[PDB]
């Protein structure tokens, strides 16, 4: 409803390398 | 006093061609 609307992009990231790998493996 | 010696002249490029990077879903 509302609490699930106000947290749409609230996904935690451990580090820059993991973010790099997560955006890299989705395009290769 | 007023003047110092010549600095090392860094030659900037004349015809560089880099790519504008695509946006990423960071």
UniProtKB/Swiss-Prot annotation, chain A:
Location(s) in or outside the cell: Nucleus
Lineage top rank: taxon: Eukaryota
Function of the molecule: Component of the transcription coactivator SAGA complex. SAGA acts as a general cofactor required for essentially all RNA polymerase II transcription. At the promoters, SAGA is required for transcription pre-initiation complex (PIC) recruitment. It influences RNA polymerase II transcriptional activity through different activities such as TBP interaction (via core/TAF module) and promoter selectivity, interaction with transcription activators (via Tra1/SPT module), and chromatin modification through histone acetylation (via HAT module) and deubiquitination (via DUB module).
Additional notes on this entry: Present with 4150 molecules/cell in log phase SD medium.
Similarity remark: Belongs to the SPT20 family.
Subunit structure: Component of the 1.8 MDa SAGA (Spt-Ada-Gcn5 acetyltransferase) complex, which is composed of 19 subunits TRA1, SPT7, TAF5, NGG1/ADA3, SGF73, SPT20/ADA5, SPT8, TAF12, TAF6, HFI1/ADA1, UBP8, GCN5, ADA2, SPT3, SGF29, TAF10, TAF9, SGF11 and SUS1.
Protein name: SAGA complex subunit SPT20
UniProt organism field: Saccharomyces cerevisiae (strain ATCC 204508 / S288c)
From Swiss-Prot, chain B:
Gene name of the record: TAF12
Note: Present with 930 (+/-45) molecules/cell in log phase SD medium.
Family: Belongs to the TAF12 family.
Domain of life of the native organism: Eukaryota
Protein species of origin: Saccharomyces cerevisiae (strain ATCC 204508 / S288c) (Baker's yeast)
Residues of the full protein shown: 353 to 378 of 539
Protein name: SAGA complex/transcription factor TFIID complex subunit TAF12
Subunit structure comment from the entry: Component of the 1.8 MDa SAGA (Spt-Ada-Gcn5 acetyltransferase) complex, which is composed of 19 subunits TRA1, SPT7, TAF5, NGG1/ADA3, SGF73, SPT20/ADA5, SPT8, TAF12, TAF6, HFI1/ADA1, UBP8, GCN5, ADA2, SPT3, SGF29, TAF10, TAF9, SGF11 and SUS1.
Record localization: Nucleus
UniProt function note: Functions as a component of both the DNA-binding general transcription initiation factor complex TFIID and the transcription coactivator SAGA complex. Binding of TFIID to a promoter (with or without TATA element) is the initial step in pre-initiation complex (PIC) formation.
């Amino acid at each position: 409803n509302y609490e699930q609307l106000m947290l749409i992009m609230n996904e935690r990231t451990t580090t820059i390398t993991n973010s790099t790998f997560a955006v890299s493996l989705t395009k290769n | 006093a007023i003047f110092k010696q010549t600095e090392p002249a860094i030659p900037i490029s004349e015809n560089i061609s880099t790519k504008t990077p695509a946006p990423v879903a960071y």
